[PDB]
Structures are given as structure tokens and as C-alpha cells.
Amino acid sequence: MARDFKPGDLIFAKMKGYPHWPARVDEVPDGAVKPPTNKLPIFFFGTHETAFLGPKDIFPYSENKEKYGKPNKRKGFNEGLWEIDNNPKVKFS
């Protein structure tokens, strides 16, 4: 979208080969000495992966919960649909 994306904001992250996946805009990970690449740190729910997608690659989970908030055939997706909606701050130590 064309809005702001906060670390901790709830989005759908779109990757090549993957549908818009429920993900969180994550915070800067330790070891990441890389400046903003026009991509933001994206934490994938249900798989707990992390990627870098831009504000245009991502769409806010709130507005598009109707759109992309649909059960998928990807593992981690449906599980992540739950995580992002219940405990979006879920990660390990």
C-alpha cells in the first residue's frame, strides 16, 4: 500500500511464489547492519521466518483481512492467520 508501516504493524507480505501471507513488520534484527533498502523487515507468521519486503509489497492486515484473510493451502499461512490476529508479537527470545 501507500501508507506508513510501523515496526509491529500488521500486514500481508507478498513474496514471489507465495500468496499475500500474514506477517508483521518486524524490528531490526541483531546483526543487520544493512540500512533501509526500501524494504522493511517482515516477520512471517506460522513459519516464523523473516524477509524484507517493501511498503508496496505489503498490505495492512486490518484493511485486507477480508481480502487475504482466507485459508490457504500453504502450511504456516493458516497457522499464521491465527498468530497475527491473536498474538502478533509472538517470537522467541
XYZ file of C-alpha atoms in Angstrom:
93
model
C 0.000 0.000 0.000
C 0.927 3.618 0.196
C 0.776 4.341 3.854
C 3.199 4.136 6.754
C 4.360 0.909 8.209
C 5.373 0.761 11.795
C 7.615 -1.844 13.394
C 4.970 -4.023 14.892
C 2.296 -3.137 12.279
C 0.189 -5.951 10.906
C 0.452 -6.728 7.257
C 0.283 -9.218 4.490
C 3.531 -9.940 2.909
C 3.680 -10.894 -0.646
C 6.612 -12.919 -1.976
C 7.201 -14.387 -5.404
C 5.547 -17.811 -5.462
C 3.627 -17.138 -2.325
C 0.230 -15.556 -1.755
C -0.145 -12.478 0.426
C 0.925 -14.059 3.720
C 0.008 -12.729 7.193
C 3.142 -11.141 8.518
C 4.273 -8.430 10.838
C 6.546 -5.560 10.118
C 9.290 -6.683 12.397
C 12.021 -4.789 14.165
C 15.638 -4.526 13.141
C 17.291 -7.825 13.828
C 20.620 -8.104 15.560
C 23.385 -8.395 13.050
C 21.512 -6.481 10.394
C 23.962 -3.729 9.544
C 22.002 -3.041 6.421
C 20.276 0.376 6.049
C 16.682 0.688 4.664
C 16.640 -0.953 1.282
C 13.090 0.386 0.596
C 12.234 -2.900 2.106
C 11.161 -3.441 5.624
C 11.862 -6.391 7.957
C 8.918 -8.717 7.650
C 8.203 -11.491 10.087
C 6.117 -14.279 8.636
C 3.599 -15.828 10.945
C 3.090 -19.573 11.220
C 6.539 -20.221 9.810
C 8.307 -17.595 11.943
C 10.521 -16.651 9.024
C 11.775 -13.187 8.301
C 12.095 -11.403 4.997
C 12.462 -7.947 3.518
C 9.579 -6.572 1.529
C 8.702 -3.028 0.680
C 5.692 -0.916 1.730
C 4.228 -1.705 -1.645
C 4.846 -5.450 -1.283
C 2.916 -5.422 1.894
C -0.659 -4.637 2.611
C -2.138 -3.944 6.065
C -3.790 -6.958 7.649
C -6.522 -4.806 9.061
C -7.898 -3.381 5.794
C -7.274 -6.519 3.826
C -8.259 -9.134 6.409
C -11.251 -9.593 4.183
C -9.170 -9.905 1.070
C -6.223 -12.006 2.013
C -7.521 -13.229 5.297
C -8.528 -16.521 3.704
C -7.398 -20.101 4.492
C -4.682 -21.212 2.251
C -3.073 -24.370 1.144
C 0.262 -23.209 2.412
C 1.318 -24.561 5.785
C 2.106 -21.817 8.256
C -0.282 -19.499 6.480
C -3.393 -20.624 8.300
C -1.475 -21.027 11.478
C -0.111 -17.553 10.992
C -3.645 -16.232 10.374
C -4.232 -17.161 13.961
C -0.926 -15.822 15.325
C -1.242 -12.430 13.722
C -4.811 -11.981 14.916
C -4.291 -13.269 18.478
C -0.669 -12.854 19.412
C 1.037 -10.703 16.690
C 4.012 -10.119 18.967
C 4.887 -13.791 19.028
C 8.520 -14.646 18.771
C 11.161 -16.368 20.780
C 13.837 -14.856 22.973
